């Protein structure tokens, strides 16, 4: 039937940054959670709240698909209730989450021998992010007591740093494309079901 659009959300030309992750509603379609295992020999499929073989038996109404690129040593931070410089200022999952965080190495897709300011991450922020919140704002972070007046100087930093992605790095510094498949079920006719 109408296969869910899991082809352009996973196999895309360029993915998102950690501070500007993209949501995508996936609905009015029949999801097939089996074509994902063509993507990468190195393919983690950590799920929460749902068994990896139970998605093909339940019906949901709106399955959301986030996307961002994080370094290796930072996947673990995409988990319910876990701290870190990425899971506090860029993307935080709720403590009671129902989904499947998916990650895979992408050192061949997007890693050029130069460093490109293509993937950014938020290093400084006022407070921690609420669950499912995106802050694309780029105001000058006041790190001291004097006002910044919109100029990045002393005690006033730019709140976005750029990752360095080179193929010569170790497994703990190569880019990892991550997609968080959320599943919500409201009082509405469920459209996203399994292949029957």
């Amino acid at each position, epitope marked *: 039937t109408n296969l869910c659009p899991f082809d352009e959300v996973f196999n*895309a030309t*360029r993915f998102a940054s950690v501070y500007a992750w993209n*949501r995508k509603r996936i609905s009015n379609c029949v999801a097939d959670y089996s074509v994902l295992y063509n993507l990468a020999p190195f393919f983690t499929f950590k799920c929460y709240g749902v068994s990896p073989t139970k998605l093909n038996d339940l019906c949901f109404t709106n399955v959301y698909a986030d996307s961002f690129v994080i370094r290796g040593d930072e996947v673990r931070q995409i988990a319910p209730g876990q701290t870190g410089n990425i899971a506090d200022y860029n993307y935080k999952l709720p403590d009671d989450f129902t989904g499947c965080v998916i990650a895979w190495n992408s050192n061949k897709l997007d890693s050029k021998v130069s460093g490109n300011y293509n*993937y950014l991450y938020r290093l400084f922020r006022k407070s921690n992010l609420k669950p499912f919140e995106r802050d694309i704002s780029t105001e000058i972070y006041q790190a001291g007591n004097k006002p910044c007046n919109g100029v990045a100087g002393f005690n006033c930093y730019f709140p976005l740093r750029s990752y360095s992605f080179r193929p010569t790095y170790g497994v703990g510094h190569q880019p990892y494309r991550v997609v968080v498949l959320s599943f919500e079920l409201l009082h509405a006719p469920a459209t996203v079901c399994g292949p029957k």
Partner: antibody
Amino acid sequence: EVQLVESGGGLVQPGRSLRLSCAASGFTFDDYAIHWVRQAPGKGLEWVSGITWNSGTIGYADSVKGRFTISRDNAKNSLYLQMNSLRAEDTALYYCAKHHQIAVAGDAEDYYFDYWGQGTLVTVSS
Amino acid sequence: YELTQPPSVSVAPGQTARITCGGNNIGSKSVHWYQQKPGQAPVLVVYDDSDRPSGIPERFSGSNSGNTATLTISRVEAGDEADYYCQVWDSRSDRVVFGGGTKLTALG
């Protein structure tokens, strides 16, 4: 039909920052990559940056790396471009150009603009 | 990449004009052209060297071969005086390379 209205622009001192916006209206702001392209007064065109349908940069120029940052908001139908550390050679009419194709998954990267706007004169002087 | 165009190409409104854009090995990557009247926004003309958008007359045509892309405008008129730019992708540096456009001026 397509109305790529661009807001944000004016006189700013060398070394300060401003934020540009581009409110789209007419098409679906979830399947078309939208770029930013400048044009100095009577001095040709120049490409700044761009973002695909998923919010991801398609690259920067050879003179705006590290100083410019582009962001996309698919819910409000608006593309944003942050300009930090402006200099005297950044005075131009910044356009907001779209992409003709629908950005299918498996293809070859080739961006050609089909709908343009009017631009905002971002003058940088003392 | 780096595209180079003739700074000015003039032709009487009886014949065709020859606008070229040459680089290093621009024979395979797609070459798109743009037209910009003085004051207005750049409009689209024949792209991919083989097809034009909806509305552009059949007079506009293109051809790319090896190291030269030719935007041959047929039956040039007075209302076609504009600044024509050529575009390329250059997947090597993740950019969008334009070029110093040509000022087509109907002489006479």
